[PDB]
Amino acid sequence: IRWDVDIIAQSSIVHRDDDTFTLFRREKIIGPDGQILQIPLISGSSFRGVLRRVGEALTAEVLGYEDVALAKSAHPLTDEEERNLKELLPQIAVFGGAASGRVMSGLLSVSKVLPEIAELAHLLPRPPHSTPLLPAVLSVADESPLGRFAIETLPAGTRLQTWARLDNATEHQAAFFDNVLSTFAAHGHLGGRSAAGHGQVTATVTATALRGSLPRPTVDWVNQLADD
Amino acid sequence: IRWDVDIIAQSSIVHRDDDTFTLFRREKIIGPDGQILQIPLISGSSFRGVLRRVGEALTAEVLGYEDVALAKSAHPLTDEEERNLKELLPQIAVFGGAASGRVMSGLLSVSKVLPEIAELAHLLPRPPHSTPLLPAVLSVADESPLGRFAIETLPAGTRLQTWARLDNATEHQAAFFDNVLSTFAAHGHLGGRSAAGHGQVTATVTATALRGSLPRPTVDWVNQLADD
Amino acid sequence: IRWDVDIIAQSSIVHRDDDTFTLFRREKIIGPDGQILQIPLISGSSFRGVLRRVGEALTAEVLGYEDVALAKSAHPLTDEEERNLKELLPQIAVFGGAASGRVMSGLLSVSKVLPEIAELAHLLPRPPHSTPLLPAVLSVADESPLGRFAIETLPAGTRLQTWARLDNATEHQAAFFDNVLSTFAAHGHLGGRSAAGHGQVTATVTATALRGSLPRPTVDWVNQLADD
Amino acid sequence: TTPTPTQVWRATVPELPPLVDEAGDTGSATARAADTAERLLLLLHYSIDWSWVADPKHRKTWDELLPGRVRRAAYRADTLDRWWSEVAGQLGAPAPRHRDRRLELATLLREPALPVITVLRDSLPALLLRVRIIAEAVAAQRG
Amino acid sequence: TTPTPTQVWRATVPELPPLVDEAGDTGSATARAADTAERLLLLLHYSIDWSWVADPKHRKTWDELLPGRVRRAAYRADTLDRWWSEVAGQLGAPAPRHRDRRLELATLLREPALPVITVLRDSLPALLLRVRIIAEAVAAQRG
Amino acid sequence: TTPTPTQVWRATVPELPPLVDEAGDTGSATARAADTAERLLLLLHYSIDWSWVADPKHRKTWDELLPGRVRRAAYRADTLDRWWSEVAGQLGAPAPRHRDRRLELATLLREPALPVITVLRDSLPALLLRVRIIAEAVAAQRG
RNA sequence: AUUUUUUUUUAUUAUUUUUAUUUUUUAUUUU
């Protein structure tokens, strides 16, 4: 099952690159028609990370968080390598991770965003406009010497097109990811200054193109054994 | 909990950009329907800063200010990194800051203002009017050569729509922010020449759409240990 | 029968070589005109492995996978060496393998990919550009110390040219491989970070230059005896 | 047919090719507004005595006070109120005894009339460079 | 025929050979945009008093505030709005009493006008090195 | 005639004989590109304050962050965009008040300009060893 | 009087947190 999402912004979307100095917008290149061009786009891993935070927040609303032991790392303790918990816990089975050195396999594959005028996304909603138009707001000038800052951002009206995909149409994980995308369509955000109103978007989910998930299935109430 | 505020101006709202020369109004762009347009709007960080000043003024009415040691900066002294004071002090827990190099996390996220005719705010109260109408008063001409100045401002009748949000419906901080918005609805202001009557507005707070704060809770009388 | 495929990328194609440190792109050398040069190219075995995974996934949609006993190895048990199953099972007959020490013979031979400007592929679609242009995106910086990573990749607009070949125009295996290439042209991928949108391509299959496969033949419904 | 007296102004400076198009207003909408604004503001410098305060350059009535007064009048709607505010502001004269200028002007005072104010705001001094060049050249051919 | 006053600027520094080509713009399209951008920004430093804030170097009006203001004005479309934003920003002066500079400037304010903004964005300080060198050399020949 | 201020840099370390040839660039084409790359990157370490993050070694501004930033800027074309990306990245300063350095730099920013990027890619740290040695030696003669 | 055959470098990781364009200026006077 793949999900096609169209995302229309409602504010500026600041996405940082990798004395009163500016700091740019992340830009990736394309060779569309024989020449090299730079275009702005949020990296596809940022969307995956936002969905990861949303999924971990949603899986704690029905499971207790009073006890522990996100972005996992690798370290060996005793190499315990039985992984039935993918069936038990529907979060690390979908999005992957690293527990004890042996990294996991994630069913989810998600693509980058493409706001600008190119030929790489799916079908366009409008006749095009020019490419170099990502004009920049000017920042807040701390004013305890008021050091003038300035950031670079997409304008508030740009449309974005993205698709995510789960290949194995097997079990409740499709409904779990549908709930995650419902939350992200309801009150999602992506950007870098969400505490200042930068990054408010409204999305729509469409085009479940393969064998659909059955209505009213279980999300996580599987008696909550709450293992490690 | 999110708070939806409608703000009707009662005077001109001058908000500066970033020999007898003028000085404009801050304008941010939108791509609404395929073309680029410039519209005036107060940046969303200015509203956050005004609320920050209001909150710091309100937290000093019950806590003594005879001793010290706002807009915080970052510098390291010894990197003392225990942060229980978020529970003790309800001001820096909500609005964030930087103490000793490690910046804080702010629960508050607030959006920009949208006065003009667009499609980005919530539901409109009136049939629309034209976009380029932000006519300008002419300034005061010092008259010790009387150098004629001139500023650019919104007219006195423009409505504005804004929403603020605290995500974690946990504790007294919702009531504290409700008190802050009560103060701002009572005698708030936003603009750039409040000493000359520019920026007087009247607001209303509405639409606590999630689990509401219980009536008569404690604001800050938690025995005032008054630590650093 | 040989199949000529032209592959246009739709995203970055990361293909790894063999503290905040980078990690490069695989590069193979050419002596084109008397001097030694390094050019990036995906190894031809990677394409064969991707087609192997696609073929094994496709052969399990019509044959039950509830019982077992891919990348095979060699070990002797009793050296049972009758191999009629090449006619019965159309997967290991085409792509080869090792069952009990005696390795198999694969009819398929597939060539490497050649994206860059050289003289080794078949006919070019465009006037050329410079060679050293494989600029690199910067990675995701884990942010639990946010360790900045960086990978090296081809840009999203590079064309690629490849040919595969089955020599023995005999039986249904040509139609089976045509179905495999149809799947790979539909929703194929090649690269190293397909979970982050890296490696999405669109291909076209052309130029069956020898005795063609007859329309509507049997793929695998040969009564499914399902032997070892 | 008519000389269209705003055309014989622009005809004195062929080193500046026209703004709109080769032979007719096609393919651009803001160019029509810019041309209308330039023609309107050009029929404002030769409509007065240069009757204002007098020094041997008349204080650049040209960037000393003309852009300020035009900008200040450009904060009203739609176009008739704008021209009233300007003509009461700067000097005050309808048109000389040349009925072609008067008829062309009064034809011009109404249009779509929304984007013209935007053109007077978002690009003032380019139009002033244009008007200064045409005025200087047509003055130079009567020296 | 004409001295073309942006040519006599560049003529003072022969140690920097030209950017475009030997004798005419052939074989490159971005070089024309880069040359147009350099000429446009060169006709912006000698168009003002150096009337700004005063210290014995005038605060490098040159990398202290000129690239910031040029960049900030470079986020509008297409070219007339850009020059309005700049001239209202930095100091404010159309051109001195040299009609060759004025006519060359007003000829320049329109072009293809899409790649010029891209040139002002994707390579700012090389053009500033160029303008600083020509300005310093033509100042040095009047010392 | 001129001291050519990138020559008096290399003159402080005679224990490292030159790379190109005995007295002139003959018989090798990649040596010219390597020398141009070394000279360009040498006119990048003495063009800034060492204004960056401060510890008693300034965090090796030298293999801690200089090769990373130079490599990251080396993924653009051709050379002006590269230097813009670098100078906006690392610290930001055109050149000090020494017009010889400025003129030599702005002469250098254009060349064949294709193999220079290849030289910055396929051999980075040898050039960094060179620049570190010359910088350390010319610092040592002012101790 | 072939050293031939078979053998994806691959799973996993938000460039995130913090930040008022602020403070000052009778369109005065003269018939």
Residue numbers in the entry:
A (entry chain d), B (entry chain c), C (entry chain e): 18 to 35, 42 to 92, 107 to 181, 205 to 288
D (entry chain h), E (entry chain i), F (entry chain j): 2 to 51, 54 to 64, 66 to 147
Quote the study that presented this structure, word for word.
We reveal the cryo-electron microscopy structure of a type IV-B CRISPR ribonucleoprotein (RNP) complex (Csf) at 3.9-Å resolution. The complex best resembles the type III-A CRISPR Csm effector complex, consisting of a Cas7-like (Csf2) filament intertwined with a small subunit (Cas11) filament, but the complex lacks subunits for RNA processing and target DNA cleavage. Surprisingly, instead of assembling around a CRISPR-derived RNA (crRNA), the complex assembles upon heterogeneous RNA of a regular length arranged in a pseudo-A-form configuration. These findings provide a high-resolution glimpse into the assembly and function of enigmatic type IV CRISPR systems, expanding our understanding of class I CRISPR-Cas system architecture, and suggesting a function for type IV-B RNPs that may be distinct from other class 1 CRISPR-associated systems.
The type IV-B complex resembles a sea cucumber, with six Csf2 (Cas7-like) subunits forming a helical “backbone,” and five Cas11 subunits comprising a helical “belly”. Each Cas11 subunit sits upon a Csf2-Csf2 interface. The “α-helix bundle” topology of Cas11 and presence of a contiguous positively-charged patch running along the length of the minor filament are typical of Cas11 small subunits in class 1 CRISPR systems (Rollins et al., 2019; Xiao et al., 2017), although the arrangement of helices within type IV Cas11 is distinct from type I and type III small subunits. Like other class 1 Cas7 proteins, Csf2 adopts a hand-shaped structure with fingers, a palm, and a thumb. The palm makes extensive contacts with the bound RNA (buried surface area of ∼1200 Å2 per Csf2 subunit), while the thumbs of neighboring Csf2 subunits protrude into the center of the palm, inducing a kink in the RNA backbone and a “flipped” base at six nucleotide intervals (typical of other class 1 complexes (Jackson et al., 2014; Taylor et al., 2015)). Csf2 subunits are intimately connected (1021 Å2) and make a network of contacts with bound RNA (∼1200 Å2 buried surface area per Csf2 subunit). (F) Cas11 binds at the interface with buried surface area of 505 Å2 (150 Å2 and 355 Å2 with Csf2.3 and Csf2.4, respectively). Csf2 had significant similarity to the type III-A CRISPR Csm3 (i.e. Cas7) subunit (Dali Z score of 14.1), despite a sequence identity of only 16%. Csf2 and Csm3 superimpose with an r.m.s.d of 2.9 Å and use equivalent interfaces to bind RNA and induce near-identical RNA backbone conformations (r.m.s.d of 1.5 Å). Although the M. sp. JS623 type IV-B operon contains both Csf3 (Cas5) and the putative large subunit Csf1, we did not observe corresponding densities within the high-resolution cryo-EM structure.
